Amino acid sequence: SMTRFDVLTVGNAIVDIISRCNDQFLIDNQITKAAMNLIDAERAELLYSRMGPALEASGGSAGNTAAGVANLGGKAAYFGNVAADQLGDIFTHDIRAQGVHYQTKPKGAFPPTARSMIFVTEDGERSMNTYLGACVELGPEDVEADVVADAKVTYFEGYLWDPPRAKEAILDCARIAHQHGREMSMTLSDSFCVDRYRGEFLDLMRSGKVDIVFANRQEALSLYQTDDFEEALNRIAADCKIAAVTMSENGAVILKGRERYYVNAIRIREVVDTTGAGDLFASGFLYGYTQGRSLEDCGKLGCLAAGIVIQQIGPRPMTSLSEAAKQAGLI
Amino acid sequence: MTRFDVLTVGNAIVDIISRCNDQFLIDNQITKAAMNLIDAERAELLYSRMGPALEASGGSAGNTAAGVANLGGKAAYFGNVAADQLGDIFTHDIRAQGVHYQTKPKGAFPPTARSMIFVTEDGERSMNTYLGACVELGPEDVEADVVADAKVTYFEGYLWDPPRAKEAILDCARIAHQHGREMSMTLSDSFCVDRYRGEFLDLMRSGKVDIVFANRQEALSLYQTDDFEEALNRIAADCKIAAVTMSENGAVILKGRERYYVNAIRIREVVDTTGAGDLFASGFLYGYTQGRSLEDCGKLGCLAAGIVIQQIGPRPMTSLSEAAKQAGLI
C-alpha cells in the first residue's frame, strides 16, 4: 500500500492580483474575456497602471489543485518555480501552509515571481493577464524523482507548454511515474492554450504519456476544432483512458472507454468569482480517484469543490472542503 | 477652492489576512482585538504558523484616505514603504483609488511593513504588525504644500510607536493651523492609548488636534475609567469635536455641550471587522469637509463602517458613493 503522495501537481507558480472591472474595461484594453492572456513585462506595467485597487492571493492552476487536494485531506506535492523575492515568499508560504510538499528552490531574483492580473466582471467571469517571470526557469532540474516515484497521480498543466523547458520536466515525470506504476494526468488549461499546442496535447494522450485528461467544454471543442460537443466527447474518450469534461452550471461528464457518468453541478448562491473552478474540480476528482472512489463519486467531489470556490474571492477555498464533503455525504 | 479635502498620515502597511480558531490566539499569546507590535524574528515565527493568507493594502490612515476618495472626496496620504514588491503593491493600491501618494521609499531595508491579521469566527480581528519601513517616516516626508492645501489633516495615534513620525505630525499641525485648516487624530487602539495617554491628551489640550476619533475602549483607556459617561464628558472638554464609535451601538458625536447619537446600520453578517473605525473616519471626514451636519457626518461614518465589516479586507471593494446615494445621505 503506502505511498508518500496521492497527487503531485506541476505548474506555473503564480501570485494573483485580483480586481473587479466593468465590461468596457476588457474591450478598452483588448483583454480576451474568460481567457488566459500572456503578457510581457512592459504590458504588465501598463495594465497594472490601469488596474483598480487589488487583492493578492497565491494562484497557479496546478498550485490551486494541490492546495485543494490537501484541504480535502489527501496528501499533495507541488513543483513550480518562483523567484527569491517577496511574492515568491508569499507563494511558498501559502502552499506549504496548506500542507502541500513544496521544495522547488528559487534560482535568483530575476526574472521576478510570476503574477496574473485577474479581472472579474459582474457576471463572475475571470479574465487573466499573466506575466510568466520566473516560471520560464522551470526545467528537468526541478523534478524531484523520488516524489514522482512516490505519488499515485502526477498532474500537470497544458499551460506548461508556454515556458520553454517545462515540457522536458513533464516528459521526465511521465517516464518516472509510469516506470513506478503510477498515473499521469493533465488539464487542457485554456482554449487558446489548446489552439497553441493541439497536436502536442493529442500526442501526449495517444502515446500514453497522459492517462487522465481534464477539459472544459470550450477546451474539448478546441481540441478537435469542432462545434459538435457530442463529437468532442466521443473523440476525447477514444484518445485517453479517462476524461473528465466540465460544463460549468451544466455539471460534468466522466468518460472511460464506452462508460459515461454524468454529474450535476451543485447549488450556487451567487457566482462571486469563477477563478479556480476547473482547478478545484480536478482537486475533488483526483482526491476521490486516489481514495479508490467510483468515477461518479470523483465527479461529485469535483463538482462540490468547484462550486465552493466560485462563491468566494480568490482561487483557493478558505473553508474546509473535507467538512463540506462529509456534510454532503461524499465523505 | 482647496486641492484636498482630507490628508491622512500613518503607517503604510500591507495586510496578510487569515481566519483562525480561538485557541490559535491563546497558543500564540496574541492579544485579541488589539494591535500587537512584533519584531522581525517574531514576524517570521508567526508567519510560519499562519495558514494560507490573502494580501491587501492596509494601514489605518491609508484605509481612511481610500474611503474618502471612494466616497467622492479628494484625499492625500503620507506614509513610508520600502523599495520592494510589497511597497509597489501598497503604492499601486492607494494611487489606484485616486489618493495623492508621493512619499518616496528610502531603501529596501527595513522592508515594507506587514500586519498579520487573524480573523476569528466572531469577525473580530487581531493584528500583529512589523513596522519595517514605517520607522523611517520623518519631517522630510512632509509635503508642506499638500498640508497647506488640505481642509483636514488626520493622523494615527499609531504614529507614536515609530521614532520620528511625531516630528512630522507636529510640523503638519503647525502648517495646517497657519493656513486655517483643521487637525484630526484617531486614538487607534486601547493599548496604544495606554502607551501615549499623556502625549495624546497634550495634543488635544494644546489645540494641536481639533477633531478626535475614538472607540468605546479607547475613550475608557484615555481617562483610565470604567464609566463611559465620564469618558464622554471628559473627551468633550478636551477637544473641539469628538466622534466616539460604539460598534453595533452606533456612534455619538460631541461638540461642547452638543451630543448627536447615530444608529449603526443593519448588516447581513460580521465577516471581518478590520477597517471599521478607519472607514467610520472616512465617512465622517467626507461629510465634514462637504459642510454636512455633525449628525449627517456620523451617519456617513456608520454607513461606511457597516459596509467594510461585511467583506474580507480593510478597504471597501464596492462604491461608497453609490451606497450613500441609495441611503439618501447624498
Ligand SMILES: Nc1ncnc2c1ncn2[C@@H]1O[C@H](CO)[C@@H](O)[C@H]1O
Ligand atoms: N499561464 C498560466 N499558467 C498556470 N496558471 C495560470 C496561468 N495564468 C493564470 N493562471 C492561474 O489560473 C488560476 C485559475 O485557474 C489562477 O489562480 C491563476 O493564477
Ligand SMILES: Nc1ncnc2c1ncn2[C@@H]1O[C@H](CO)[C@@H](O)[C@H]1O
Ligand atoms: N501599527 C499600526 N499602525 C497603523 N495601522 C495599523 C497598525 N497595525 C495594523 N494596522 C492597520 O490597521 C488596519 C485596520 O484598522 C489594517 O488595515 C492594518 O493594516
Ligand SMILES: COc1ccc(C2(C(=O)O)CC2)cc1
Ligand atoms: C502587476 O503585474 C506585474 C507588474 C510588474 C512586473 C514586472 C516586474 O519587474 O515585477 C515588470 C515585469 C510583472 C508583473
Ligand SMILES: COc1ccc(C2(C(=O)O)CC2)cc1
Ligand atoms: C509575515 O510578515 C513578515 C515576515 C517577514 C518580515 C521580515 C522581512 O525581512 O521581510 C523579517 C522582517 C516582516 C514581516
Ligand SMILES: NC1=Nc2cccc3cccc(c23)N1
Ligand atoms: N514596474 C516597473 N518594473 C521595473 C523593473 C525593472 C526596473 C524598473 C525601473 C523603474 C521602474 C520600473 C522598473 N517599474
Ligand SMILES: NC1=Nc2cccc3cccc(c23)N1
Ligand atoms: N523596466 C523599466 N520599467 C520602467 C517603468 C517606468 C519607468 C521607468 C524608468 C526607467 C526605467 C524603467 C522604467 N525600466
Ligand SMILES: NC1=Nc2cccc3cccc(c23)N1
Ligand atoms: N525575498 C527573498 N530573498 C531571498 C534572498 C536570498 C535567498 C533567498 C532564498 C529563498 C527565498 C528568498 C531569498 N526570498
Ligand SMILES: NC1=Nc2cccc3cccc(c23)N1
Ligand atoms: N536567504 C534569504 N531567505 C529569505 C527568506 C524569506 C524572506 C527573505 C527576505 C529577504 C532576504 C532573504 C529572505 N534571504
Ligand SMILES: NC1=Nc2cccc3cccc(c23)N1
Ligand atoms: N530577518 C532574518 N535575518 C536573518 C539573518 C541571518 C540568518 C537568518 C536565518 C533565518 C531567518 C533570518 C535570518 N531572518
Ligand SMILES: NC1=Nc2cccc3cccc(c23)N1
Ligand atoms: N523570513 C526571513 N526573512 C529574512 C529577511 C532578511 C534576511 C533573511 C535571511 C535568511 C532568512 C530570512 C531572512 N527569512
Ligand SMILES: NC1=Nc2cccc3cccc(c23)N1
Ligand atoms: N521593487 C522596487 N524596486 C525598486 C528599486 C529601486 C528603486 C525603487 C523605487 C521605487 C520603488 C521600487 C524601487 N520598487
Ligand SMILES: NC1=Nc2cccc3cccc(c23)N1
Ligand atoms: N527603480 C525601480 N522602480 C521600480 C518600480 C516598480 C517595480 C520595480 C521592480 C524592480 C525594480 C524597480 C522597480 N526599480
Ligand SMILES: [K+]
Ligand atoms: K474564486
Ligand SMILES: [K+]
Ligand atoms: K473588513
